[PDB]
Amino acid sequence: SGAIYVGNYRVVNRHLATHNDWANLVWEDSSRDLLVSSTTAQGCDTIARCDCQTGVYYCSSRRKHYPVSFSKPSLIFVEASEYYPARYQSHLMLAVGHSEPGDCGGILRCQHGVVGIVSTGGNGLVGFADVRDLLWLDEE
Ligand SMILES: CN1CCCc2ccc(S(N)(=O)=O)cc21
Ligand SMILES: [Zn+2]
């Protein structure tokens, strides 16, 4: 579990979005496993605006933050998970690291702020859904 809290927006894995998220929907994309909902209080997170490929991510199944190198976002064949079929996911970044299903929502951060959230796992990789192309998270 985990979210990004930027302005009056809550960014979560689409597959973990709650009824309240869907009832207060701003934007969602199944291809990228992302959903954004509205918030009452303003959030503490800043979104990175950058092409960094190094950062740190939180791994709940280890209670640890790990430094990683990651790819720029791509269309990656993701093997079957407990929450998704074997399928293609867009705007996905991969790193070598530990990821189990419950690690979804962990933040990846660079020197510029929040890059994305854990979205995929298995076979010694962790995948992150990128948010840095969502400039509209910074305004309105
Ligand atoms: C929209 N466009 C161009 C700019 C950045 C970017 C990154 C990933 C993907 S993709 N192939 O995962 O849909 C598409 C894309
Ligand atoms: Zn950066």
Curated annotation (Swiss-Prot):
It catalyses: Selective cleavage of Tyr-|-Gly bond in the picornavirus polyprotein. The active site is at H15 (for protease 2a activity), D33 (for protease 2a activity), C104 (for protease 2a activity). Zn(2+) 1 binds at C50, C52, C110, H112. Cysteine protease that cleaves viral polyprotein and specific host proteins. It is responsible for the autocatalytic cleavage between the P1 and P2 regions, which is the first cleavage occurring in the polyprotein. Also cleaves the host translation initiation factor EIF4G1, in order to shut down the capped cellular mRNA translation. Inhibits the host nucleus-cytoplasm protein and RNA trafficking by cleaving host members of the nuclear pores. Counteracts stress granule formation probably by antagonizing its assembly or promoting its dissassembly. Homodimer. This is Protease 2A. It comes from Coxsackievirus A16 (strain G-10).
